[PDB]
Nucleic acid binder design. Sequence first.
DNA 1: GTAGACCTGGACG
DNA 2: CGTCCAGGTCTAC
Length: 314
Amino acid sequence: SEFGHRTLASTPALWASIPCPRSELRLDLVLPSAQSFRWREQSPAHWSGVLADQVWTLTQTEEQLHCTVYRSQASRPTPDELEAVRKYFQLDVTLAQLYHHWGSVDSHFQEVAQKFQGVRLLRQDPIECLFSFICSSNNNIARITGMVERLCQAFGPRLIQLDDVTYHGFPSLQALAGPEVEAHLRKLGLGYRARYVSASARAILEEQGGLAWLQQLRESSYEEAHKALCILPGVGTQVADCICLMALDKPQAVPVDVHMWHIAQRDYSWHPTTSQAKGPSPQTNKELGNFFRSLWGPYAGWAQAVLFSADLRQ
DNA sequence: GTAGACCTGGACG
DNA sequence: CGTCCAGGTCTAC
Ligand SMILES: [Ca+2]
Ligand SMILES: [Ca+2]
């Protein structure tokens, strides 16, 4: 009871709640939907992972988001630490207001929106988001998830252990830019992305002015941020969009992958009209992105997150 | 602006 | 056992 991952039932006194209706957040529809690849449902309906450099377990009731943290001396989370969670799930953003708007201008979103409530966007750390998505290219979520895990296990700070699970924080640029990192990542099976990781880490540290260069993109504009990110190895339009949307506060950024392409064709009968290409191409992918923006608005990225998530549950 | 190939490994035939 | 195929990016014409 004092060991292993906690559950709301077993260690009652160690959980603190945050008012949050399932209409505003559905953990099972956000955490395993390829925004963050670091959450695991260790026990039914309980998700644990690293947030704000500490390990947490989250679970929800119809009107509450229950939280518990593992830092010395087991205690319920504090209001300050709880804010860390609120900020991670960007709770100041009312999802009901967004769904209502998207639903108003897009009949198809409406239909899907009724079956998939609470799909919101996580506010992620730039470094973790940058390297996790460099790992997502031409790959499948199950594999991506493993890659990221082994990568953190080998190069990230060790935090605490629950059961047989040792949690690690996300690696720093220095660690990823270290000597022989590529070869070690290839042994961990990242394929050719192994080179993308060490190259992009070194590129950022020895050419772009380090971490500061990335974090300042949050104040920068979407157009600039997206272009800057495309400088890095392994980072194309799609990965860059994922980063702008999920880590740089660019809510209009719209990732265009195989999923969003199928969705566009199947649910909107969309086809490239200004691009020469007939199928996926750097030009058409860009047009689709603008298409979704002119359909959903300033938060088109968040609308994209709802349909992508729903298309996964298929 | 456009075909090909490219690490890895779980589903098709 | 052996081809797509997955939250694509890159590079040769
Ligand atoms: Ca693909
Ligand atoms: Ca690039």
